[PDB]
Design a binder for this molecule. Structure first.
Ligand SMILES: COc1ccc(CCNC(=O)c2nc(-c3ccc(OC)c(OC)c3)no2)cc1OC
Ligand SMILES: COc1ccc(CCNC(=O)c2nc(-c3ccc(OC)c(OC)c3)no2)cc1OC
Lengths: 277, 269
């Protein structure tokens, strides 16, 4: 069932059968979160989940794309993801199209840009860690000293957290390694998105659009408090369809909202299958 | 040419031909505003426009629906509108469905609800007319204004400003009076659920004149306010501002998509 970074959610038949749906993991979760979507798709639809790898968004796609091709050849490709998953799905669509492959569906489940770009500057790193430290004071009922900004501001997101965690440890707080790994992994995967180099795409994209980001996403990054009607995709995708679903980003992957996603995606898959004839 | 409130933009051939597109006027405009859209729609598509009549939004569609049925009989109905005209088109779709008619396309060109409800209270009436005075770059007695409906408000304020010594040509005053009231009528529209496919062509934002008119137009939701009324809702982002959605080059993005929709309907006959 787990082979490297590919999880089999529903195996395709030994030969022929329906076009598989490739789903991509969200930050801090695995592709098991697509089980409710799978239940709202047509019977016998195969589904494979791509789990986390390292690198920039671009680098991650360079690892996925050869694997996609080993599995599915020239196409057709159906690529779906919620949250960071949607960004990874799109980046895969881009890589596959560069190689001449047939991409027929790109389904983005509330994968919505920050309402303003996230500056990649020393000043923003300072302001971000001052916010985080303020929340940590309240929560851990503790006084945080002067931040060693000169050191943090030269590191990448991984290095910044590694520095903060080494400081927390020789502060005298010992965190269970599984909580560290989970928190660190989630944080860095969500930060990867901020510097995704989005390329134009020539095919059809379907954006399932919730009303707003949830509170934990806004705590993470305050610029998620505002969103545009096109989720930031309009300049890159001329053939863009938006399917409003309401609710919050965190709800979009679960029952009951996922039924709306599934009903729509089911018709799109049905159209792809009939076309294949 | 024109017959009552019905404008012929392109008459359908006397037998056969394509399904007509029915368009509805925006505030302060005529249905001639749809000619650029028509240019981007399939060749020989008939088009008829419904021009201004009196009433609440619902009363207007009470006049339009008998007329629609007069022209097209059973269906298929294709209803399109920009701005106020989207709201009118939608109100017509609701009336036609009550009469059992076949509505196959409802095209809303950036017909987007204000980000919050416009309160129907005396303090809002006061706030509103204060904001309009300040766009002077007179004085207004509130006790009287705040008891009047929209029609009486606008006539009362116009009377105070000519009494002040300002001279605006009567034809301009009248055109601005009905533009104002037609947009204001949308605020109390009683939106009903619709059981078919709606396509909402979605701009990035309202233009500045719209926000000056009603500041709540500064904020919009991803569904344009329609999600609670329409379960089969498709949003087609088009970018730009409201006022540009009806013109070249943005109307080409509308027309390219609409043209695929209408071709699907022609085949299915
Ligand atoms: C602590 O919990 C969280 C914290 C933050 C998030 C949101 C992360 N952001 C996204 O999912 C997301 N960005 C985009 C997106 C979409 C389009 C873009 O360019 C056009 C783009 O340019 C960088 C980004 N598409 O999706 C989710 C969380 O919990 C699940
Ligand atoms: C001075 O120039 C202007 C001033 C104001 C406007 C905007 C008027 N508003 C609209 O076009 C409009 N409201 C809606 C809408 C849509 C959905 C609704 O509920 C579901 C709703 O419930 C009240 C309203 N759909 O469209 C346009 C202007 O110039 C063109």
């Amino acid at each position: 069932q787990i082979d490297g970074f590919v999880r089999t959610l529903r195996a395709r038949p030994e030969a022929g059968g329906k076009v598989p749906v490739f789903v991509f993991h969200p930050a801090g979760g695995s592709t098991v979160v697509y089980e409710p979507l799978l239940g709202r798709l047509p019977a016998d639809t195969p589904m494979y989940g791509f789990e986390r790898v390292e690198g920039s968004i671009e680098e991650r796609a360079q690892q996925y794309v050869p694997k996609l091709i080993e599995m599915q050849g020239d196409g057709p490709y159906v690529l779906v993801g919620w949250s960071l998953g949607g960004v990874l799905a799109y980046a895969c669509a881009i890589g596959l199209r560069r190689l001449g492959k047939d991409v027929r569906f790109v389904g983005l489940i509330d994968a919505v840009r920050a309402g303003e770009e996230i500056p990649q500057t020393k000043e923003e790193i300072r302001k971000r860690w001052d916010r985080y430290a303020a929340f940590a004071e309240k929560t851990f009922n503790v006084t945080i000293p002067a931040i060693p900004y000169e050191q943090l501001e030269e590191l990448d997101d991984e290095g910044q957290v590694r520095f903060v965690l080494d400081a927390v440890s020789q502060s005298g707080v010992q965190i269970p390694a599984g909580i560290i790994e989970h928190q660190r992994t989630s944080y860095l995967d969500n930060r990867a998105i901020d510097t995704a180099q989005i390329q134009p795409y020539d095919g059809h994209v379907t954006l399932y659009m919730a009303d707003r980001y949830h509170d934990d996403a806004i705590m993470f990054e305050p610029r998620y408090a505002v969103r545009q009607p096109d989720g930031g995709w309009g300049e890159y995708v001329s053939d863009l369809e938006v399917v409003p679903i309401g609710g919050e980003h965190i709800q979009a992957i679960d029952e009951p909202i996922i039924a709306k996603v599934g009903e729509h995606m089911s018709r799109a898959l049905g159209q792809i299958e009939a076309d294949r004839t």
